Amino acid sequence: SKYNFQTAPNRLSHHTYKWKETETDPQLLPAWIADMDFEVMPEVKQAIHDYAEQLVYGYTYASDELLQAVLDWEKSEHQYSFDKEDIVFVEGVVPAISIAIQAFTKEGEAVLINSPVYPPFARSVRLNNRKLVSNSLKEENGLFQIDFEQLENDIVENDVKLYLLCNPHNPGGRVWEREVLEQIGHLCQKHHVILVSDEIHQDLTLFGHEHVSFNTVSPDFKDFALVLSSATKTFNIAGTKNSYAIIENPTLCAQFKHQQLVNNHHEVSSLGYIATETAYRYGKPWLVALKAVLEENIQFAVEYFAQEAPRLKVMKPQGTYLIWLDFSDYGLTDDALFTLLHDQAKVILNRGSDYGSEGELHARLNIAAPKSLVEEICKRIVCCLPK
Amino acid sequence: SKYNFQTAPNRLSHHTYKWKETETDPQLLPAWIADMDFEVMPEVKQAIHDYAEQLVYGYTYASDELLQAVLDWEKSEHQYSFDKEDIVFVEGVVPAISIAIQAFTKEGEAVLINSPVYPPFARSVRLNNRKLVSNSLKEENGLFQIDFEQLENDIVENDVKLYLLCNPHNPGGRVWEREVLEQIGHLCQKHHVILVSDEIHQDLTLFGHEHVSFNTVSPDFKDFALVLSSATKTFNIAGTKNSYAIIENPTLCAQFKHQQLVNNHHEVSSLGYIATETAYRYGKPWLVALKAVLEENIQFAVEYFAQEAPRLKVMKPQGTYLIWLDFSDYGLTDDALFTLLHDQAKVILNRGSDYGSEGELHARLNIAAPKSLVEEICKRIVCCLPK
Ligand SMILES: C=C(/N=C/c1c(COP(=O)(O)O)cnc(C)c1O)C(=O)O
Ligand SMILES: C=C(/N=C/c1c(COP(=O)(O)O)cnc(C)c1O)C(=O)O
Ligand code: NA
Ligand code: NA
């Protein structure tokens, strides 16, 4: 209808990560990194034009209007109320994760993640010389679940100081229930663990699934937990480089901001600020339209794979626009899977093994593209699977 | 038919640092932070419109065209030849300084600066729990000069591991001679010091003074020295957030890039990349024209202050568009000077004391604005100085 979800803008010649390989091999169709193929909402494009027409591109600060936009988005969309002083802007969520690790732990101390998970989680812990504790998620009835007995064991046995939670969880697209988050929080309270809730996918919950922001679970959770999010995944504006932490606890907030300044990682670009404010101000109708398209694409993929590759195990996302595929029933190695998809099927999917050992013989599929493209990508995925 | 240096775009609705106080108090005229009031070169404005017209604002990386533009600028403007692989982009120079401190020293080790100097120098050392060694610049015949005897004493007595050099030096605008840089480099070789040369103002040398980029002084200097620079100060694009380190030594380069990744400080915004490439590709004629305006503004200020405030000691910049003013002959304290300028004169100048103890009773004046505004600011500065 009014917004364009039919035709993908041509990204070749714009130095995108997503289309980089395709620029050398034109047959390759990318469906990996979490950028969407869709045109961004028109108000953001207009805001970039308006930025140009400032004529001067000097140092700018985070305005009260931007702060209010974040406050209003969190309250309106996620029922999460806090003060403007609790917002800390950071040029990205992955930046924020390293700052959090450096601020809240010392070298050698243990940081826990639920594996398999977005690879910068494990990387950021290891490169910072913290001890990584991978709490392996169970898979039951096609969904990831937390083994709470082993999670406590992992916390206690390793003296875990910090828990990097992914909510919604990437990969898999798991939209944790309030009851799950409450159990996590109680464990953090018991064992004196600080929790960082990476909620970057929070606006992308689907099929009736509702995001529960971590500190909305219990009024005391802010004593040990902070929330990271952004407009970038929601609105396909990852190249504008802005995001935020909500840190209501004064001590945690000071410690984060201090580390951020120690790292000189405290400034954001002018368009970073503009694009986030604009997206939150005008983006809701576009987001509604987006989510309908994503649901149709996911449903199509699940049904198509059921019909054309019944042996392929498909985890239906509860949120995110990313589908976790399990090729374990096929007579392939992890490396042979990669070369089959990339070289024979000519489709670029994230290698599941990037996400941890649980990702062996998996791949991750990005369906945030026009339906015609999603149909082509799914056709390629089933085309060359071995008997 | 000509570049505009006659009128300044209105900044008041655009959340600039420079005009922030004036938004609340319309009587105040800013001349502090190093943003220019001048319109940016027209090709950058067009590049921002062109970015808007990509329609999708996803993750991008530094292109070969951008890398070549930096290489070409460094060779043509500064006679500094190196390879594309030696370039490391960082969202800002101040970011790069923290990364360098973290990468090249251990907690508790000594880092040297020449004081007084841009305040993030001292701050980045101190906040990083390194020992700060301030090598105090002499002032002789209106110019800063290094005391090489004391500099060596400072290096040896404190076991200095890292030297943060400012060239051109801010404040004061001192354009160090080749022979001065030679002697600095030789001390670093003798005492096994790593040197970071902050050359962000390298394109703004004036009155026939020529920038000498540090690693051009001797082919050996790359073994211990790296250069930081940017398009942002040269072209008035600080809000676009991109800059680079040139690190020809493989070990130093790996060290820096490693720490940058540990800190998740490795990515830059898409417009950051675009604005730098464009500025370097098209900016030379604009820069030529700017320099003539800056020299005129500086000459006006010196002459005006000479007549209207002969007791005011004015350090004439050899480069940068910033003038270091010394009010120490007046019966004022540092705090009374600030109050006088800000509350009585209604002008916002950087407090000299921000830059170190040598800046007591000083202020710094930004003349990168139309001559009419410079004239007004200078008139205000001399209106209310005490007998
Ligand atoms: C783009 C992807 N993920 C984005 C992501 C990010 C990206 O953050 P920044 O772009 O803001 O650094 C952060 N946290 C989580 C849990 C994420 O899934 C991807 O998996 O391709
Ligand atoms: C804007 C100012 N100085 C800029 C500056 C900067 C600014 O760097 P980034 O904006 O790239 O972080 C870095 N290094 C030196 C020696 C500088 O003088 C000022 O003094 O107001
Ligand atoms: Na594992
Ligand atoms: Na001092």
- Are B239 and A58 a contacting pair at CB < 8 A? yes
Asked if A261 is an interface residue toward chain B (Cβ–Cβ < 8 A), one would say: yes
User: Kind of pairing, strands B194-198 and B243-246?
Assistant: unpaired
CA–CA separation, A90 vs A322, rounded Å? 25
Q: How far out from the chain centre does Cα B169 lie?
A: 7
Asked whether the bond before B119 is cis by omega within 30 degrees of 0, the reply is no
CA–CA separation, B387 vs B380, rounded Å? 16
State the amino acid at position B252 in one-letter form: L
Ligand 2 centre to CA of B229 (Å) is 10
Q: How far is B176 from chain A (nearest CA, A)?
A: 27
With contact defined as beta carbons under 8 Å apart, do A308 and A81 qualify? no
- A86 — phi, psi (to 5°)? -85, -5
CA–CA separation, B125 vs B131, rounded Å? 7
**What is the DSSP-derived secondary structure letter of residue B216?**
G
Q: What angle do CA A294, A295, A298 make, to 5 degrees?
A: 85
Helices B42-52, B270-282: crossing angle, 10 deg rounding? 150
For A198, the enclosing helix (H) or strand (E) is strand A194-198
With contact defined as beta carbons under 8 Å apart, do A226 and A82 qualify? no
The first and second tokens of residue A180, run together, are 């799950």
**CA proximity to B192, closest of B221, B224, B214:** B224
Location of structure tokens 């050698």: A108
The first and second tokens of residue B147, run together, are 């005391």
- B384 — phi, psi (to 5°)? -130, 25
CA–CA separation, A187 vs A112, rounded Å? 13
CA quadruple B79, B81, B85, B87: dihedral, nearest 10? -20
End-to-end CA distance of chain A: 42
**Burial code of A72-103, b = ≥16 C-beta within 10 A, e = fewer?**
ebbeebbebebeeebbbbbbbbbbbbbbbbbb
Please give the C-alpha separations between residue B139 and each of B136, B337, B362, in angstroms, as whole numbers. 10, 21, 13
Domain coordinates in residue numbering, chain A:
1-57+283-384, 58-282
With contact defined as beta carbons under 8 Å apart, do B352 and B319 qualify? no
Which residues have CB less than 5 Å away from ligand 4 (the ion)?
Answer: B 134, 356-357
Q: How far out from the chain centre does Cα A10 lie?
A: 24
With contact defined as beta carbons under 8 Å apart, do A229 and A205 qualify? no
Out of A57, A99, A238, the one facing B40 most closely (by C-beta) is A57
Location of structure tokens 């600030």: B338
Q: What is the sign, positive or negative, of the torsion defined by CA atoms of B307, B311, B317, B323? A: negative
**CA proximity to B111, closest of B196, B189, B227, B186:** B196
Asked if A44 is an interface residue toward chain B (Cβ–Cβ < 8 A), one would say: yes
| Chain length of chain A | 387
Asked if B237 is an interface residue toward chain A (Cβ–Cβ < 8 A), one would say: yes
**CA proximity to B90, closest of A127, A270, A265:** A265
Q: Where are the beta strands (DSSP E) in chain B?
A: 29-30, 87-90, 110-115, 131-136, 138-140, 143-145, 160-166, 194-198, 225-229, 243-246, 313-315, 322-326, 347-348, 350-351, 362-366
Closest-CA residue in chain B for A42? B55
User: Kind of pairing, strands A29-30 and A322-326?
Assistant: unpaired
CA–CA separation, B189 vs B117, rounded Å? 23
CA–CA separation, B23 vs B17, rounded Å? 10
List own/partner pairs for B5-13 with CB under 8 A and 24 or more apart: B5/B38, B5/B289, B5/B290, B5/B293, B5/B370, B6/B370, B7/B370, B8/A56, B8/B37, B8/B38, B8/B39, B8/B369, B8/B370, B8/B373, B9/A54, B9/A55, B9/A56, B9/B37, B9/B39, B11/A54, B11/A56, B11/A58, B11/B37
With contact defined as beta carbons under 8 Å apart, do A5 and A290 qualify? yes
Q: How far out from the chain centre does Cα B161 lie?
A: 23
- CB atoms under 10 Å from CB of B170, counted, come to 26
Ligand 2 centre to CA of B232 (Å) is 9
**Neighbouring residues of A151: CB distance < 8 A, sequence distance ≥ 6:** A135, A184, A187
CA–CA separation, A350 vs B178, rounded Å? 52
Residue nearest to atom 3 of ligand 1 (CA): A34
For B100, the enclosing helix (H) or strand (E) is helix B93-104
- CB atoms under 10 Å from CB of B247, counted, come to 26
With contact defined as beta carbons under 8 Å apart, do B356 and B116 qualify? yes
Residue B351 pairs with which residues in a beta bridge? B363
Domain B58-282 has CATH 3.40.640.10: yes
Out of B9, B46, B62, the one facing A54 most closely (by C-beta) is B9
Residue A164 pairs with which residues in a beta bridge? A113, A196
Asked if B355 is an interface residue toward chain A (Cβ–Cβ < 8 A), one would say: no
CA–CA separation, A196 vs A224, rounded Å? 9
- Are A60 and B17 a contacting pair at CB < 8 A? yes
CA–CA separation, B17 vs A63, rounded Å? 11
**CA proximity to A189, closest of A219, A209, A211:** A219
A92 lines ligand 1 (CB under 6 A): yes
The first and second tokens of residue B344, run together, are 């009585």
**Neighbouring residues of A80: CB distance < 8 A, sequence distance ≥ 6:** A74, A213, A215, A216, A227, A246
CA–CA separation, A219 vs A229, rounded Å? 19
Sheet holding A225-229, edge to edge: A87-90, A243-246, A225-229, A194-198, A160-166, A110-115, A131-136
**CA proximity to A144, closest of A174, A167, A122, A115:** A174
Ligand 4 centre to CA of B360 (Å) is 10
Location of structure tokens 């096609």: A142
Nearest-ligand number for the alpha carbon of B91 = 2
Residue A230 alpha carbon, nearest atom of ligand 1: 11
With contact defined as beta carbons under 8 Å apart, do B245 and B337 qualify? no
Ligand 2 centre to CA of A217 (Å) is 43
The burial of B138, by beta-carbon neighbours within 10 Å (0-12 exposed, 13-18 middle, 19 or more buried), is given as: exposed
Asked if B36 is an interface residue toward chain A (Cβ–Cβ < 8 A), one would say: yes
May I ask the CATH architecture of the domain A1-57+283-384? Alpha-Beta Complex (3.90)
Q: How far is A330 from chain B (nearest CA, A)?
A: 33
B92 lines ligand 2 (CB under 6 A): yes
**Neighbouring residues of B275: CB distance < 8 A, sequence distance ≥ 6:** A57, B44, B47, B48, B231, B237, B240, B242
CA–CA separation, A268 vs B241, rounded Å? 8
A33 lines ligand 1 (CB under 6 A): yes
With contact defined as beta carbons under 8 Å apart, do B374 and B56 qualify? no
End-to-end CA distance of chain B: 48
- CB atoms under 10 Å from CB of B217, counted, come to 21
State the amino acid at position B264 in one-letter form: N
- A319 — phi, psi (to 5°)? -165, 175
Mutate to test the pocket of ligand 2, among B35, B164, B170 (most ligand atoms within 8 A of CB): B170
Asked if B56 is an interface residue toward chain A (Cβ–Cβ < 8 A), one would say: yes
Q: What is the resolution of this structure in A?
A: 1.8
User: Kind of pairing, strands B131-136 and B29-30?
Assistant: unpaired
With contact defined as beta carbons under 8 Å apart, do A28 and A11 qualify? no
A230 lines ligand 1 (CB under 6 A): yes
H, E, C per residue of A230-289: CCHHHHCCHHHCCEEEECCCHHHHHHHHHHHHHCCCCCCCHHHHHHHHHHHHHCHHHHHH
Asked if A18 is an interface residue toward chain B (Cβ–Cβ < 8 A), one would say: yes
Q: What angle do CA A252, A255, A257 make, to 5 degrees?
A: 105
CA–CA separation, A90 vs B1, rounded Å? 41
CA–CA separation, A92 vs A180, rounded Å? 27
Q: Which of residues 70-129 of B touch A (CB under 8 A)?
A: 91-92, 94-95, 97-99, 102, 120, 124, 127-128
With contact defined as beta carbons under 8 Å apart, do B236 and B36 qualify? yes
Asked whether the bond before A171 is cis by omega within 30 degrees of 0, the reply is yes
As separate numbers, helices (DSSP H) first and strands (DSSP E) second, chain B gives: 13, 15
CA–CA separation, B288 vs B235, rounded Å? 11
CA–CA separation, B75 vs B83, rounded Å? 11
The first and second tokens of residue B68, run together, are 């070549």
**Neighbouring residues of B216: CB distance < 8 A, sequence distance ≥ 6:** B78, B79, B80
CA–CA separation, B344 vs A344, rounded Å? 75
Nearest-ligand number for the alpha carbon of B117 = 2
Residue nearest to atom 8 of ligand 2 (CA): B93
Please give the C-alpha separations between residue A271 and each of A56, A363, B48, B92, B133, in angstroms, as whole numbers. 13, 34, 10, 15, 37
State the amino acid at position B332 in one-letter form: L
With contact defined as beta carbons under 8 Å apart, do B89 and B69 qualify? no
**Burial code of A236-246, b = ≥16 C-beta within 10 A, e = fewer?**
bbbbbbbbbbb
**Neighbouring residues of A149: CB distance < 8 A, sequence distance ≥ 6:** none
CA–CA separation, B257 vs B87, rounded Å? 10
